[PDB]
Every structure is written in structure tokens, then in C-alpha cells.
């Protein structure tokens, strides 16, 4: 059977606000598809805050967790407030323009508990800027201005410190979160599925196949006509969060007013023992 794999990922966003004060810095962390931590520099005396149930219990296993992480986030915010003007200098952009730095880093772990992939990537204004290579040894700057950052980061031995984190604390903390958040992260909640029926005219109806409250986010919805796939003819919305830690998705199909019985909806999701076939 399929071997599990899980991911711990952190997302940094820092953007300048000319005329409206200092740059802002927001960071979030995710274990697989569940957010568990946040930090906003705009807050009054900003602290790292829990955003998942099991993080409310992390203080008894590690009473220093929040102090440790608040310091690091406050340090990351200062680093990127400066980095905004450094990069702007590299491109000689005006000070009156707003610009964004983004960073995504984390680790994928295998079923055994060892590292599969480490990654660290940065964007500037929504385009690749610099990224750690798969060897976790060198960087890849995306344009001429980014080579400024790679030279500074090469001469400072940053990759070795990055790699040490990715193979080290990242793996260890993913495993700690997976155990403490076991009831949330290791669940496979199947979709609550049903078909709805909307007449548009005397000769045409809409058939909509719903999938509600499922976790993880990965899912497949297809419509079939006697056994024939219908992807081009159907409208498939992008999977969306429901606000309670789960996801929704639907696929709809316009169908002749006497032919509803000839179409089936098919739902595959990790929480389902068997793929579901529904019919109106």
C-alpha cells in the first residue's frame, strides 16, 4: 500500500508600504495542509501564535517554544525589512513603489521518518529571485540583481546553515507535530457527497456533484456519460477551504431534461474505502 509522506512548510511575506509606515512581515507555518502557527509584525509587540488545536498543548512539552519562535520571527522580520531596500537598490527602483519579498522553505519526510527533500525558495514581486539547489549546497539566482544576494550568501556560508536546519530541526519538528497533532494531521476525512439538480429550462438541467468537508485537500471529481469521461463538458471549481479545517469541491454538467439517469459522478479520495459512484 501507499507509503505516507508529510511536509512541514513555512511561508514568509514581507512588503514595503511607502507613505504608510514601516514594511510589514507576515509568516505562517503548515504541516501538510493544516496551518498551525502565525506571526504578524504589525501587531502590538508581535508574538508567534498558535493556529491549530494541538499547538495549544505544545507549551507543556516545550515551555520555551513560544519564546524561541517569537525571537526568531522578530529576527526574520528585521532581516526582511532591510532586505526590501537592499534588493530595491539592486534594481534601482524608486522608493515610492511597493515591493514584496516572499520565502517558502521546509522539508518533506518519508514514511520511515527520514528526509526526502529540503527546499528554500524566494520570490521578489511574485517572480523567482533565488532558490536553494537540490544538493542544499549552492544557490541559483534568477537574474543579475539576484546574483548580489547569492554572492553575499555564498561568502557567508548560509547554505550550510540552511541545510543544517532542513535536515535537522525541520525533520525533528515535523515528527513532533505529527504525533501531537495526530488526530488532526493523520486523519483521512472522506467527502460528504451528493448531487443537486437545477432546471434551467424545459429541455435542459444542471447536475452538480458536491464534495464537502474532506481532508486532505487532494481529490478527484469526474462526470461520466454511460461510462465516457466528461471533463471538457463539465465546470470544475478550484478546491476551496470551508473555514473549519477541511475542503470543498464540485463539478457541474449541463444535461438534457430526460437524460439525467444516464450520467454518474465519481469521487476518489484517500478517506474513501472505495471510489464513490453517484447517480441522480
Amino acid at each position: 500500500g501507499s507509503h505516507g509522506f508529510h511536509s512541514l512548510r513555512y511561508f514568509y511575506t514581507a512588503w514595503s508600504r511607502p507613505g504608510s509606515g514601516e514594511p510589514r512581515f507576515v509568516a505562517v507555518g503548515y504541516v501538510d495542509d493544516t496551518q498551525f502557527v502565525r506571526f504578524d509584525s504589525d501587531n502590538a509587540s508581535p508574538r508567534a501564535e498558535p493556529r491549530a488545536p494541538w499547538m495549544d498543548l505544545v507549551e507543556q512539552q516545550d515551555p520555551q517554544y513560544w519564546d524561541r519562535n517569537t525571537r526568531n520571527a522578530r529576527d526574520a522580520a528585521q532581516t526582511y525589512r532591510v532586505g526590501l531596500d537592499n534588493v530595491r537598490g539592486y534594481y534601482n527602483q524608486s522608493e515610492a513603489g511597493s515591493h514584496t519579498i516572499q520565502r517558502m522553505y521546509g522539508c518533506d519526510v518519508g514514511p520511515h521518518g527520514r528526509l526526502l527533500r529540503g527546499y528554500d525558495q524566494l520570490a521578489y514581486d511574485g517572480a523567482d529571485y533565488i532558490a536553494l539547489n537540490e544538493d542544499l549546497r549552492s544557490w541559483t539566482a534568477a537574474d543579475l540583481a539576484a546574483q548580489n544576494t547569492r554572492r553575499k550568501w555564498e561568502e557567508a556560508g548560509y547554505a550550510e546553515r540552511d541545510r543544517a536546519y532542513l535536515e535537522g530541526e525541520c525533520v525533528e519538528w515535523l515528527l513532533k507535530h505529527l504525533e501531537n497533532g495526530r488526530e488532526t494531521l493523520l486523519r483521512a476525512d472522506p467527502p460528504k457527497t451528493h448531487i443537486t439538480h437545477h432546471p434551467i429550462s424545459d429541455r435542459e438541467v444542471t447536475l452538480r456533484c458536491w464534495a464537502l468537508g474532506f481532508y486532505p485537500e487532494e481529490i478527484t471529481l469526474t462526470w461520466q456519460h454511460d461510462g465516457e469521461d466528461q471533463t471538457q463538458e463539465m465546470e470544475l471549481v478550484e478546491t476551496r477551504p470551508d473555514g473549519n479545517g477541511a475542503f470543498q469541491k464540485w463539478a457541474a454538467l449541463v444535461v438534457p431534461s430526460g437524460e439525467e439517469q444516464r450520467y454518474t459522478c465519481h469521487v476518489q479520495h484517500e478517506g474513501l474505502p472505495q471510489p464513490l459512484t453517484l447517480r441522480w
Binding site: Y10, A27, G29, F39, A48, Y65, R68, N69, N72, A73, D75, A76, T79, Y80, V82, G83, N86, V87, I101, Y105, L122, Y129, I130, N148, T149, K152, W153, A156, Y158, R161, D162, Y165, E169, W173
Partner: peptide
């Protein structure tokens, strides 16, 4: 933990 490390671009 967040990355304790860091270096400005």
C-alpha cells in the same frame, strides 16, 4: 521552530 538563522538579501 522557525529558522533561527537568516541573512539579508
Amino acid at each position: 521552530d522557525f529558522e533561527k538563522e537568516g541573512y539579508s538579501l
